[PDB]
């Protein structure tokens, strides 16, 4: 029959389309009368959505801006994937087993700093590209290992043949929003928001909300050595782990806070880390970029 067609904007990478299709598939499980169509195409997708050329987009939470364009909203945050960083070693060694002088590929200051805090006898080397591209570079270039989000390898069904060690947050505190998806739509698209509700996972959303509040107040992002990971405790409170590190790994600010309200705990986390010198550190790093 004649039903509303929801147009879903997506990047063209294997991962992006996979994430986008996952979302569509879960939405279809409600059995409501909507058609979905992907339009292969964060900010340019946002412009299209504002212009009503698309109705929604599925982004990796960790790549979302602190502030959405007025008129847009994160309409849904589904049940989180694995939040953990993953080590993929060419010759199958766990982190502490990598040879002295091992070359670990990442363009993330957050990842490289944490690794360097544990081991000063490894080398962090810049690497870029989509996750497949990066796996090909690990094979074909001078890297002994790489770090990737466990979530992307999971989504692709690649983990089994790649992951050498899943890194616990004790070892590597994840990027804010890692493993979470931001399903972005217009704030006034009430029909769509209503459809997205059954997909929203309140415990994921609350945790991520705390992480983001902290990141916003610290003025962090992908380019800065800042981390935050919130989980829901069995008791129902959120526990937020917050971290800022010097790029060489020698100075770590790291704190835990537990509470009910994501805004209050994210804010208090930023206040505490800022009071310890973490914001000055981030400001100085940005000065040398
Ligand atoms: C903020 C940031 N983005 C990226 C590149 C990126 N974005 C999403 C993913 C997939 C995992 C997910 O959806 O959560 C990826 C790639 C990946 O991490 O697998 C980075 C990576 C920089 C790098 O390591 O070179 C970052 C920064 C960060 O994670 O600290």
Numbering used by the authors: -1 to 39, 61 to 308
Please give the exact wording used by the authors of the publication that reports this structure:
The enzyme porphobilinogen deaminase (PBGD; hydroxymethylbilane synthase; EC 2.5.1.61) catalyses an early step of the tetrapyrrole-biosynthesis pathway in which four molecules of the monopyrrole porphobilinogen are condensed to form a linear tetrapyrrole. The enzyme possesses a dipyrromethane cofactor, which is covalently linked by a thioether bridge to an invariant cysteine residue (Cys241 in the Bacillus megaterium enzyme). The cofactor is extended during the reaction by the sequential addition of the four substrate molecules, which are released as a linear tetrapyrrole product. All enzymes in this family adopt a three-domain fold in which domains 1 and 2 resemble the fold of type II periplasmic binding proteins and the third domain, to which the cofactor is covalently attached, adopts a distinct α+β topology.
In addition, the structure of the enzyme in which the cofactor has undergone more extensive oxidation is presented at the slightly lower resolution of 1.6 Å with similar refinement and validation statistics. The collection of data from two crystals, which were flash-cooled at periods of 40 and 50 d after purification, demonstrates that the dipyrromethane cofactor adopts two conformations corresponding to partially oxidized states. Accordingly, refinement of the occupancies of the oxidized and reduced states in the two structures reported here showed that the proportion of the oxidized dipyrromethanone form increases in a time-dependent manner from 30% in the case of the 40-day-old protein to 50% for the 50-­day-old protein. In both of the structures of B. megaterium PBGD that we report here, the C2 ring clearly adopts two positions, one of which corresponds to the fully reduced dipyrromethane that has been observed in structures of the E. coli and human enzymes when they are crystallized under reducing conditions. In the B. megaterium enzyme the electron-density map clearly shows that the oxidized conformation of the cofactor has the same oxygen substituent in the C2 ring, which is suggestive of the same dipyromethenone form. However, the other α-position of the C2 ring which partakes in the methylene bridge with the adjacent C1 pyrrole is clearly tetrahedral, in contrast to the trigonal planar configuration that is found in dipyrromethenone. The two structures reported here superimpose very closely, with an r.m.s.d. of only 0.17 Å for all Cα atoms. Interestingly, domains 2 and 3 appear to rotate towards domain 1 by approximately 0.6° in the more oxidized structure, suggesting that as the proportion of cofactor in the more extended state increases, the active site of the enzyme is able to close more. This rigid-body rotation gives rise to movements of several loops over the active site of at most 0.5 Å.
